[PDB]
Amino acid sequence: VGRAFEDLAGGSETAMKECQKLIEVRLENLIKKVGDLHILERWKIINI
């Protein structure tokens, strides 16, 4: 968000809607990565 403050969303040379889309693709990858053997805590993904 500091870098966004440097960008044209605040100052110059870039619009952060594409970075919003990037983190949406990250959220989509989290919904794609989807308590198996020797593991629980999948809800750590829920917290993140």
mmCIF file of C-alpha atoms in Angstrom:
data_model
loop_
_atom_site.group_PDB
_atom_site.id
_atom_site.type_symbol
_atom_site.label_atom_id
_atom_site.label_comp_id
_atom_site.label_asym_id
_atom_site.label_seq_id
_atom_site.Cartn_x
_atom_site.Cartn_y
_atom_site.Cartn_z
ATOM 1 C CA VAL A 1 0.000 0.000 0.000
ATOM 2 C CA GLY A 2 3.010 2.283 0.431
ATOM 3 C CA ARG A 3 4.045 1.511 -3.139
ATOM 4 C CA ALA A 4 0.448 2.167 -4.206
ATOM 5 C CA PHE A 5 0.752 5.535 -2.457
ATOM 6 C CA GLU A 6 3.757 6.115 -4.694
ATOM 7 C CA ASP A 7 1.742 5.072 -7.780
ATOM 8 C CA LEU A 8 -0.813 7.092 -9.769
ATOM 9 C CA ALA A 9 -3.583 5.755 -7.558
ATOM 10 C CA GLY A 10 -1.987 8.415 -5.341
ATOM 11 C CA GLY A 11 0.995 10.071 -7.085
ATOM 12 C CA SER A 12 2.100 8.841 -10.529
ATOM 13 C CA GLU A 13 2.527 6.046 -13.113
ATOM 14 C CA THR A 14 0.222 3.170 -12.044
ATOM 15 C CA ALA A 15 -3.346 2.173 -11.168
ATOM 16 C CA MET A 16 -3.707 -0.321 -8.317
ATOM 17 C CA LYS A 17 -6.807 -2.067 -9.703
ATOM 18 C CA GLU A 18 -4.454 -4.480 -11.481
ATOM 19 C CA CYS A 19 -2.689 -5.208 -8.182
ATOM 20 C CA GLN A 20 -6.127 -5.749 -6.662
ATOM 21 C CA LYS A 21 -6.714 -8.291 -9.430
ATOM 22 C CA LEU A 22 -3.320 -9.874 -8.697
ATOM 23 C CA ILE A 23 -4.239 -10.417 -5.056
ATOM 24 C CA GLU A 24 -7.638 -11.685 -6.205
ATOM 25 C CA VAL A 25 -5.787 -14.308 -8.247
ATOM 26 C CA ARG A 26 -3.868 -15.092 -5.061
ATOM 27 C CA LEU A 27 -7.201 -15.505 -3.246
ATOM 28 C CA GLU A 28 -8.328 -17.705 -6.143
ATOM 29 C CA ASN A 29 -5.187 -19.797 -5.738
ATOM 30 C CA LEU A 30 -6.012 -20.143 -2.043
ATOM 31 C CA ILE A 31 -9.514 -21.321 -2.982
ATOM 32 C CA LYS A 32 -7.767 -23.648 -5.468
ATOM 33 C CA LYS A 33 -5.234 -25.208 -3.051
ATOM 34 C CA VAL A 34 -8.227 -26.999 -1.713
ATOM 35 C CA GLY A 35 -7.222 -31.833 7.520
ATOM 36 C CA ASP A 36 -5.570 -34.714 5.663
ATOM 37 C CA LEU A 37 -3.090 -37.281 6.983
ATOM 38 C CA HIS A 38 -0.760 -35.880 9.669
ATOM 39 C CA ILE A 39 -2.327 -32.425 9.272
ATOM 40 C CA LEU A 40 -5.154 -30.233 10.534
ATOM 41 C CA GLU A 41 -5.229 -26.418 10.667
ATOM 42 C CA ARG A 42 -6.532 -25.914 7.129
ATOM 43 C CA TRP A 43 -8.442 -23.132 8.887
ATOM 44 C CA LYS A 44 -5.115 -21.307 9.034
ATOM 45 C CA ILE A 45 -5.974 -20.709 5.387
ATOM 46 C CA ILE A 46 -9.362 -19.553 6.670
ATOM 47 C CA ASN A 47 -7.712 -16.964 8.935
ATOM 48 C CA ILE A 48 -5.402 -15.724 6.183
#
